[PDB]
PDB file of C-alpha atoms in Angstrom:
ATOM      1  CA  UNK G   1      76.153 119.821  92.684  1.00 49.46           C
ATOM      2  CA  UNK G   2      77.001 117.182  95.311  1.00 48.96           C
ATOM      3  CA  UNK G   3      78.873 118.509  98.355  1.00 49.21           C
ATOM      4  CA  UNK G   4      80.858 116.633 101.022  1.00 45.78           C
ATOM      5  CA  UNK G   5      80.607 116.322 104.753  1.00 48.55           C
ATOM      6  CA  UNK G   6      83.573 117.975 106.512  1.00 43.82           C
ATOM      7  CA  UNK G   7      85.144 114.567 107.252  1.00 43.97           C
ATOM      8  CA  UNK G   8      84.650 111.278 105.408  1.00 47.10           C
ATOM      9  CA  UNK G   9      86.447 108.270 103.820  1.00 45.17           C
ATOM     10  CA  UNK G  10      88.669 107.584 106.804  1.00 42.26           C
ATOM     11  CA  UNK G  11      89.452 104.383 108.614  1.00 40.53           C
ATOM     12  CA  UNK G  12      91.280 104.359 111.969  1.00 39.22           C
ATOM     13  CA  UNK G  13      92.713 101.220 113.590  1.00 39.88           C
ATOM     14  CA  UNK G  14      93.380 101.479 117.306  1.00 42.47           C
ATOM     15  CA  UNK G  15      95.699  99.110 119.196  1.00 40.89           C
ATOM     16  CA  UNK G  16      93.356  99.176 122.211  1.00 42.73           C
ATOM     17  CA  UNK G  17      89.947 100.289 123.538  1.00 43.90           C
ATOM     18  CA  UNK G  18      88.940 103.616 125.156  1.00 43.82           C
ATOM     19  CA  UNK G  19      90.282 103.732 128.723  1.00 47.40           C
ATOM     20  CA  UNK G  20      92.716 100.820 128.308  1.00 49.32           C
ATOM     21  CA  UNK G  21      96.404 100.065 127.752  1.00 52.14           C
ATOM     22  CA  UNK G  22      97.934  98.741 124.549  1.00 50.16           C
ATOM     23  CA  UNK G  23     100.558  96.031 125.016  1.00 50.43           C
ATOM     24  CA  UNK G  24     104.100  95.911 123.675  1.00 48.96           C
ATOM     25  CA  UNK G  25     106.601  93.061 123.930  1.00 47.01           C
ATOM     26  CA  UNK G  26     109.950  94.611 124.869  1.00 45.12           C
ATOM     27  CA  UNK G  27     111.788  92.494 122.277  1.00 43.58           C
ATOM     28  CA  UNK G  28     109.171  91.658 119.585  1.00 43.07           C
ATOM     29  CA  UNK G  29     107.292  95.008 119.497  1.00 41.77           C
ATOM     30  CA  UNK G  30     103.628  95.916 119.881  1.00 42.99           C
ATOM     31  CA  UNK G  31     101.060  93.143 119.641  1.00 44.23           C
ATOM     32  CA  UNK G  32      98.905  95.288 117.336  1.00 44.30           C
ATOM     33  CA  UNK G  33     101.664  96.160 114.836  1.00 44.55           C
ATOM     34  CA  UNK G  34     102.893  92.591 114.711  1.00 46.60           C
ATOM     35  CA  UNK G  35      99.354  91.374 113.915  1.00 45.21           C
ATOM     36  CA  UNK G  36      98.671  94.168 111.391  1.00 47.97           C
ATOM     37  CA  UNK G  37     101.815  93.340 109.397  1.00 49.95           C
ATOM     38  CA  UNK G  38     101.154  89.592 109.441  1.00 49.73           C
ATOM     39  CA  UNK G  39      97.604  89.991 108.187  1.00 51.13           C
ATOM     40  CA  UNK G  40      98.215  92.734 105.629  1.00 55.20           C
ATOM     41  CA  UNK G  41     101.202  90.974 104.066  1.00 57.31           C
ATOM     42  CA  UNK G  42      99.255  87.717 103.775  1.00 56.28           C
ATOM     43  CA  UNK G  43      95.844  88.985 102.773  1.00 57.73           C
ATOM     44  CA  UNK G  44      96.092  92.403 101.078  1.00 57.53           C
ATOM     45  CA  UNK G  45      95.962  90.472  97.779  1.00 56.87           C
ATOM     46  CA  UNK G  46      92.301  89.405  98.292  1.00 60.33           C
ATOM     47  CA  UNK G  47      90.795  91.089 101.369  1.00 62.20           C
ATOM     48  CA  UNK G  48      89.711  94.662 101.903  1.00 60.43           C
ATOM     49  CA  UNK G  49      91.232  96.767 104.683  1.00 57.66           C
ATOM     50  CA  UNK G  50      88.255  96.758 107.053  1.00 53.18           C
ATOM     51  CA  UNK G  51      88.067  92.980 106.685  1.00 52.78           C
ATOM     52  CA  UNK G  52      91.795  92.693 107.367  1.00 55.24           C
ATOM     53  CA  UNK G  53      91.355  94.764 110.522  1.00 56.99           C
ATOM     54  CA  UNK G  54      88.715  92.248 111.637  1.00 54.76           C
ATOM     55  CA  UNK G  55      91.373  89.503 111.258  1.00 57.21           C
ATOM     56  CA  UNK G  56      93.726  91.658 113.347  1.00 58.86           C
ATOM     57  CA  UNK G  57      91.025  91.912 116.000  1.00 60.22           C
ATOM     58  CA  UNK G  58      90.791  88.083 116.056  1.00 64.52           C
ATOM     59  CA  UNK G  59      94.594  87.767 116.606  1.00 63.86           C
ATOM     60  CA  UNK G  60      94.664  90.381 119.357  1.00 62.73           C
ATOM     61  CA  UNK G  61      91.645  88.865 121.215  1.00 64.25           C
ATOM     62  CA  UNK G  62      93.549  85.569 121.363  1.00 63.09           C
ATOM     63  CA  UNK G  63      96.866  86.869 122.712  1.00 59.84           C
ATOM     64  CA  UNK G  64      97.831  87.106 126.370  1.00 58.10           C
ATOM     65  CA  UNK G  65     100.498  88.836 128.440  1.00 59.52           C
ATOM     66  CA  UNK G  66     103.674  87.083 129.468  1.00 59.38           C
ATOM     67  CA  UNK G  67     105.194  89.080 132.308  1.00 57.68           C
ATOM     68  CA  UNK G  68     105.459  86.881 135.449  1.00 56.33           C
ATOM     69  CA  UNK G  69     105.668  88.823 138.728  1.00 58.89           C
ATOM     70  CA  UNK G  70     103.877  91.933 137.438  1.00 59.96           C
ATOM     71  CA  UNK G  71     100.283  93.188 136.956  1.00 56.49           C
ATOM     72  CA  UNK G  72     100.598  92.305 133.259  1.00 58.15           C
ATOM     73  CA  UNK G  73     100.931  88.531 133.524  1.00 58.16           C
ATOM     74  CA  UNK G  74      98.186  86.887 131.413  1.00 53.46           C
ATOM     75  CA  UNK G  75      96.717  90.362 130.733  1.00 53.09           C
ATOM     76  CA  UNK G  76      94.582  91.010 127.650  1.00 54.37           C
ATOM     77  CA  UNK G  77      94.112  93.676 125.013  1.00 54.16           C
ATOM     78  CA  UNK G  78      91.413  94.275 122.413  1.00 57.33           C
ATOM     79  CA  UNK G  79      91.949  96.298 119.261  1.00 58.43           C
ATOM     80  CA  UNK G  80      89.186  98.075 117.341  1.00 59.44           C
ATOM     81  CA  UNK G  81      88.724 100.125 114.221  1.00 63.53           C
ATOM     82  CA  UNK G  82      86.329 102.937 113.317  1.00 64.26           C
ATOM     83  CA  UNK G  83      85.289 103.660 109.779  1.00 65.92           C
ATOM     84  CA  UNK G  84      83.698 106.418 107.694  1.00 65.88           C
ATOM     85  CA  UNK G  85      84.612 104.522 104.496  1.00 61.83           C
ATOM     86  CA  UNK G  86      81.921 104.513 101.819  1.00 61.87           C
ATOM     87  CA  UNK G  87      83.364 101.700  99.611  1.00 61.29           C
ATOM     88  CA  UNK G  88      85.480  98.571  99.940  1.00 60.30           C
ATOM     89  CA  UNK G  89      89.123  99.471 100.336  1.00 59.47           C
ATOM     90  CA  UNK G  90      91.244  96.993  98.374  1.00 55.28           C
ATOM     91  CA  UNK G  91      94.938  97.758  98.113  1.00 54.55           C
ATOM     92  CA  UNK G  92      95.417  95.699  94.894  1.00 56.94           C
ATOM     93  CA  UNK G  93      99.115  95.016  95.671  1.00 57.40           C
ATOM     94  CA  UNK G  94     101.362  94.321  92.677  1.00 55.36           C
ATOM     95  CA  UNK G  95      98.691  95.158  90.072  1.00 54.52           C
ATOM     96  CA  UNK G  96      99.194  95.453  87.177  1.00 53.48           C
ATOM     97  CA  UNK G  97     102.196  93.083  86.835  1.00 52.18           C
TER      98      UNK G  97
ATOM     99  CA  UNK C   1     108.450  89.999 104.584  1.00 49.98           C
ATOM    100  CA  UNK C   2     106.681  89.491 101.277  1.00 49.83           C
ATOM    101  CA  UNK C   3     103.332  90.809 100.018  1.00 46.04           C
ATOM    102  CA  UNK C   4     101.515  88.421  97.709  1.00 49.07           C
ATOM    103  CA  UNK C   5     100.244  90.376  94.657  1.00 47.70           C
ATOM    104  CA  UNK C   6      96.588  90.398  93.655  1.00 42.91           C
ATOM    105  CA  UNK C   7      95.696  88.492  90.468  1.00 41.63           C
ATOM    106  CA  UNK C   8      94.576  90.362  87.339  1.00 39.83           C
ATOM    107  CA  UNK C   9      91.239  88.496  87.675  1.00 39.81           C
ATOM    108  CA  UNK C  10      90.767  89.676  91.288  1.00 39.93           C
ATOM    109  CA  UNK C  11      91.279  93.289  90.215  1.00 40.18           C
ATOM    110  CA  UNK C  12      88.863  92.924  87.278  1.00 45.02           C
ATOM    111  CA  UNK C  13      86.087  91.502  89.449  1.00 47.85           C
ATOM    112  CA  UNK C  14      86.492  93.940  92.388  1.00 49.44           C
ATOM    113  CA  UNK C  15      87.634  97.357  91.157  1.00 48.30           C
ATOM    114  CA  UNK C  16      84.137  98.612  90.255  1.00 51.03           C
ATOM    115  CA  UNK C  17      82.778  98.444  93.843  1.00 48.50           C
ATOM    116  CA  UNK C  18      85.917  99.639  95.513  1.00 48.71           C
ATOM    117  CA  UNK C  19      87.797 102.914  95.933  1.00 46.22           C
ATOM    118  CA  UNK C  20      89.974 103.713  92.918  1.00 44.32           C
ATOM    119  CA  UNK C  21      93.397 102.435  93.949  1.00 39.45           C
ATOM    120  CA  UNK C  22      95.743 102.031  91.006  1.00 37.09           C
ATOM    121  CA  UNK C  23      98.124 104.989  91.252  1.00 37.27           C
ATOM    122  CA  UNK C  24     101.852 104.343  91.512  1.00 36.80           C
ATOM    123  CA  UNK C  25     102.756 105.028  94.304  1.00 36.56           C
ATOM    124  CA  UNK C  26      99.430 103.993  95.846  1.00 35.63           C
ATOM    125  CA  UNK C  27      99.865 106.915  98.193  1.00 33.44           C
ATOM    126  CA  UNK C  28     102.222 108.542 100.609  1.00 33.82           C
ATOM    127  CA  UNK C  29     102.592 106.894 103.999  1.00 30.24           C
ATOM    128  CA  UNK C  30     103.888 108.541 107.165  1.00 32.99           C
ATOM    129  CA  UNK C  31     105.311 106.470 110.022  1.00 35.48           C
ATOM    130  CA  UNK C  32     105.898 108.605 113.119  1.00 38.44           C
ATOM    131  CA  UNK C  33     107.458 106.768 116.085  1.00 36.27           C
ATOM    132  CA  UNK C  34     108.235 108.218 119.499  1.00 35.75           C
ATOM    133  CA  UNK C  35     110.383 105.978 121.622  1.00 36.86           C
ATOM    134  CA  UNK C  36     112.500 108.256 123.907  1.00 38.17           C
ATOM    135  CA  UNK C  37     110.595 110.421 126.448  1.00 36.00           C
ATOM    136  CA  UNK C  38     106.698 108.082 130.300  1.00 34.48           C
ATOM    137  CA  UNK C  39     109.043 105.113 129.900  1.00 34.20           C
ATOM    138  CA  UNK C  40     111.354 104.251 126.981  1.00 32.21           C
ATOM    139  CA  UNK C  41     109.367 102.241 124.410  1.00 34.84           C
ATOM    140  CA  UNK C  42     111.462  99.081 124.065  1.00 37.01           C
ATOM    141  CA  UNK C  43     110.528  97.273 120.872  1.00 32.69           C
ATOM    142  CA  UNK C  44     109.266 100.524 119.297  1.00 33.87           C
ATOM    143  CA  UNK C  45     112.190 100.247 116.869  1.00 36.09           C
ATOM    144  CA  UNK C  46     110.895  96.854 115.658  1.00 37.41           C
ATOM    145  CA  UNK C  47     107.355  98.297 115.140  1.00 37.44           C
ATOM    146  CA  UNK C  48     108.779 101.190 113.213  1.00 37.20           C
ATOM    147  CA  UNK C  49     110.910  99.049 110.863  1.00 37.09           C
ATOM    148  CA  UNK C  50     108.059  96.563 110.385  1.00 37.53           C
ATOM    149  CA  UNK C  51     105.652  99.275 109.188  1.00 40.92           C
ATOM    150  CA  UNK C  52     108.176 101.031 106.978  1.00 39.89           C
ATOM    151  CA  UNK C  53     108.829  97.672 105.284  1.00 42.66           C
ATOM    152  CA  UNK C  54     105.135  96.814 105.069  1.00 36.16           C
ATOM    153  CA  UNK C  55     103.968 100.083 103.508  1.00 36.73           C
ATOM    154  CA  UNK C  56     106.876 100.059 101.018  1.00 37.46           C
ATOM    155  CA  UNK C  57     105.857  96.536  99.932  1.00 38.06           C
ATOM    156  CA  UNK C  58     102.246  97.697  99.612  1.00 39.16           C
ATOM    157  CA  UNK C  59     103.393 100.295  97.072  1.00 39.66           C
ATOM    158  CA  UNK C  60     103.448 103.445  99.279  1.00 40.98           C
ATOM    159  CA  UNK C  61     106.103 106.177  99.290  1.00 39.90           C
ATOM    160  CA  UNK C  62     107.075 106.141 102.959  1.00 38.26           C
ATOM    161  CA  UNK C  63     108.036 109.175 105.028  1.00 41.04           C
ATOM    162  CA  UNK C  64     109.453 108.627 108.480  1.00 39.81           C
ATOM    163  CA  UNK C  65     109.701 110.788 111.602  1.00 37.38           C
ATOM    164  CA  UNK C  66     111.224 109.812 114.950  1.00 38.05           C
ATOM    165  CA  UNK C  67     111.139 111.238 118.482  1.00 38.87           C
ATOM    166  CA  UNK C  68     109.112 114.394 117.884  1.00 37.68           C
ATOM    167  CA  UNK C  69     107.607 116.881 120.345  1.00 36.56           C
ATOM    168  CA  UNK C  70     103.832 117.489 120.284  1.00 40.22           C
ATOM    169  CA  UNK C  71     104.391 120.799 118.498  1.00 43.59           C
ATOM    170  CA  UNK C  72     106.686 119.169 115.890  1.00 41.82           C
ATOM    171  CA  UNK C  73     104.212 116.352 115.309  1.00 41.01           C
ATOM    172  CA  UNK C  74     101.445 118.887 114.660  1.00 41.58           C
ATOM    173  CA  UNK C  75     103.626 120.967 112.301  1.00 42.42           C
ATOM    174  CA  UNK C  76     105.064 117.999 110.410  1.00 40.85           C
ATOM    175  CA  UNK C  77     101.680 116.234 110.071  1.00 40.29           C
ATOM    176  CA  UNK C  78     100.271 119.428 108.617  1.00 39.18           C
ATOM    177  CA  UNK C  79     103.285 119.665 106.221  1.00 39.30           C
ATOM    178  CA  UNK C  80     102.663 116.065 105.209  1.00 39.16           C
ATOM    179  CA  UNK C  81      98.914 116.585 104.663  1.00 39.10           C
ATOM    180  CA  UNK C  82      99.745 119.593 102.436  1.00 37.59           C
ATOM    181  CA  UNK C  83     102.186 117.787 100.106  1.00 37.75           C
ATOM    182  CA  UNK C  84     101.336 118.180  96.385  1.00 36.90           C
ATOM    183  CA  UNK C  85     101.737 114.459  95.705  1.00 40.97           C
ATOM    184  CA  UNK C  86      98.332 113.802  97.322  1.00 41.05           C
ATOM    185  CA  UNK C  87      96.525 115.108  94.198  1.00 42.62           C
ATOM    186  CA  UNK C  88      97.934 112.357  91.980  1.00 44.05           C
ATOM    187  CA  UNK C  89      97.846 109.437  94.442  1.00 44.17           C
ATOM    188  CA  UNK C  90      94.774 107.396  95.294  1.00 44.49           C
ATOM    189  CA  UNK C  91      95.029 106.953  99.093  1.00 43.87           C
ATOM    190  CA  UNK C  92      97.028 107.950 102.183  1.00 44.42           C
ATOM    191  CA  UNK C  93      98.403 106.154 105.280  1.00 46.44           C
ATOM    192  CA  UNK C  94      99.406 107.686 108.622  1.00 44.98           C
ATOM    193  CA  UNK C  95     100.771 105.508 111.460  1.00 43.52           C
ATOM    194  CA  UNK C  96     101.429 107.059 114.895  1.00 44.40           C
ATOM    195  CA  UNK C  97     103.317 105.068 117.521  1.00 42.03           C
ATOM    196  CA  UNK C  98     103.846 106.530 120.998  1.00 41.50           C
ATOM    197  CA  UNK C  99     102.439 106.679 124.516  1.00 41.49           C
ATOM    198  CA  UNK C 100      98.998 108.171 124.730  1.00 41.55           C
ATOM    199  CA  UNK C 101      95.752 108.752 126.582  1.00 41.68           C
ATOM    200  CA  UNK C 102      92.153 108.549 125.377  1.00 42.31           C
ATOM    201  CA  UNK C 103      91.942 110.739 122.263  1.00 41.75           C
ATOM    202  CA  UNK C 104      95.562 112.018 122.325  1.00 43.36           C
ATOM    203  CA  UNK C 105      99.153 110.941 121.865  1.00 44.25           C
ATOM    204  CA  UNK C 106     102.337 112.074 123.546  1.00 46.53           C
ATOM    205  CA  UNK C 107     105.233 113.935 122.017  1.00 50.01           C
ATOM    206  CA  UNK C 108     108.698 113.223 123.408  1.00 49.56           C
ATOM    207  CA  UNK C 109     108.322 116.387 125.541  1.00 45.86           C
ATOM    208  CA  UNK C 110     105.378 114.776 127.412  1.00 47.46           C
ATOM    209  CA  UNK C 111     102.894 117.180 125.824  1.00 50.77           C
ATOM    210  CA  UNK C 112      99.733 115.912 124.138  1.00 54.35           C
ATOM    211  CA  UNK C 113      98.512 116.111 120.577  1.00 52.96           C
ATOM    212  CA  UNK C 114      94.745 115.594 120.301  1.00 49.44           C
ATOM    213  CA  UNK C 115      93.818 113.000 117.653  1.00 50.51           C
ATOM    214  CA  UNK C 116      90.848 115.072 116.539  1.00 53.04           C
ATOM    215  CA  UNK C 117      93.386 117.724 115.489  1.00 54.57           C
ATOM    216  CA  UNK C 118      95.313 115.086 113.506  1.00 54.79           C
ATOM    217  CA  UNK C 119      92.236 113.822 111.629  1.00 55.39           C
ATOM    218  CA  UNK C 120      91.159 117.378 110.935  1.00 54.19           C
ATOM    219  CA  UNK C 121      94.412 117.986 108.993  1.00 54.94           C
ATOM    220  CA  UNK C 122      93.332 115.297 106.492  1.00 57.22           C
ATOM    221  CA  UNK C 123      89.640 116.147 106.225  1.00 57.95           C
ATOM    222  CA  UNK C 124      87.684 117.440 103.200  1.00 58.44           C
ATOM    223  CA  UNK C 125      88.009 121.105 104.194  1.00 58.34           C
ATOM    224  CA  UNK C 126      91.713 121.141 105.043  1.00 56.68           C
ATOM    225  CA  UNK C 127      93.017 118.498 102.646  1.00 57.21           C
ATOM    226  CA  UNK C 128      91.074 118.945  99.412  1.00 53.62           C
ATOM    227  CA  UNK C 129      93.648 116.842  97.486  1.00 54.67           C
ATOM    228  CA  UNK C 130      92.480 113.726  99.380  1.00 52.88           C
ATOM    229  CA  UNK C 131      88.706 114.364  98.976  1.00 52.21           C
ATOM    230  CA  UNK C 132      86.863 111.110  98.231  1.00 50.70           C
ATOM    231  CA  UNK C 133      90.104 109.142  98.656  1.00 52.82           C
ATOM    232  CA  UNK C 134      90.560 106.550 101.421  1.00 52.52           C
ATOM    233  CA  UNK C 135      92.716 107.689 104.323  1.00 51.16           C
ATOM    234  CA  UNK C 136      94.048 105.066 106.714  1.00 47.80           C
ATOM    235  CA  UNK C 137      95.271 105.812 110.231  1.00 47.27           C
ATOM    236  CA  UNK C 138      96.889 103.267 112.548  1.00 49.12           C
ATOM    237  CA  UNK C 139      97.359 104.386 116.144  1.00 49.42           C
ATOM    238  CA  UNK C 140      99.642 102.407 118.457  1.00 45.43           C
ATOM    239  CA  UNK C 141      99.295 104.219 121.795  1.00 46.29           C
ATOM    240  CA  UNK C 142      97.559 103.574 125.147  1.00 46.83           C
ATOM    241  CA  UNK C 143      94.094 105.102 125.622  1.00 46.81           C
ATOM    242  CA  UNK C 144      94.141 105.024 129.421  1.00 49.27           C
ATOM    243  CA  UNK C 145      96.044 103.377 132.248  1.00 49.73           C
ATOM    244  CA  UNK C 146      93.591 100.546 133.057  1.00 48.75           C
ATOM    245  CA  UNK C 147      95.251  97.143 132.489  1.00 51.70           C
ATOM    246  CA  UNK C 148      92.783  94.532 131.204  1.00 51.60           C
ATOM    247  CA  UNK C 149      92.997  91.571 133.564  1.00 50.78           C
ATOM    248  CA  UNK C 150      90.934  89.383 131.250  1.00 50.30           C
ATOM    249  CA  UNK C 151      87.919  87.256 132.113  1.00 54.93           C
ATOM    250  CA  UNK C 152      87.205  83.555 132.241  1.00 52.22           C
ATOM    251  CA  UNK C 153      85.360  82.031 129.334  1.00 50.04           C
ATOM    252  CA  UNK C 154      82.235  80.312 130.685  1.00 50.57           C
TER     253      UNK C 154
ATOM    254  CA  UNK A   1     108.176  90.713 128.704  1.00 50.74           C
ATOM    255  CA  UNK A   2     104.927  92.483 127.849  1.00 54.18           C
ATOM    256  CA  UNK A   3     104.496  96.119 129.033  1.00 55.09           C
ATOM    257  CA  UNK A   4     101.924  98.937 128.617  1.00 55.19           C
ATOM    258  CA  UNK A   5     102.219 101.652 125.933  1.00 54.96           C
TER     259      UNK A   5
END
């Protein structure tokens, strides 16, 4: 009979890269969470999760820090995800009606 | 916030090459936010509410934890991974929002929980109820202190 | 303003 590796079928989205800082707007919240919610609410109907995380990556790559007079003005962030998924992950929201 | 539903036709043409994901609830979701400690995480409240709303709209039963020590996070994540509902759901979500360092996140006590320990709680050996089911983790935490200054596009 | 997590 088929056995499993110890760990599989996980996907992990990270707000930032190894060694770096993730950015948070003191009023509006974290760049990564804001992007994640915008993409997932808009696209979970027809896009799988790894593909939605790619759209999140695009949003995060484009954003820049607004913090004049500190080391964070115009700063950047890049998100990433790692995957041991073995299938498309569609959330199929609101199905069946 | 609103989540547009998939069409019956989308489901019919995609379900065969995707993870089974039709249980109601779709899964349990845990949103664990640490805001009070390492500086106060202003805006962390907005992140927390945003995800709770999002996962509820995506059809998840959402559990919430706030301002936990590293030991409490470990204990409560393990409790969550061991819930019986995982056998009858199709997927799982865990979101962790805090300060962190590469491979670890901070509890409110300034002690570290290693992410490898977190993932292990949900693996095939320790969480047999989620075997072969997709498990999503979203980690909002720094992975180092280096600020990215950005580079000019040539 | 933007700050580091």
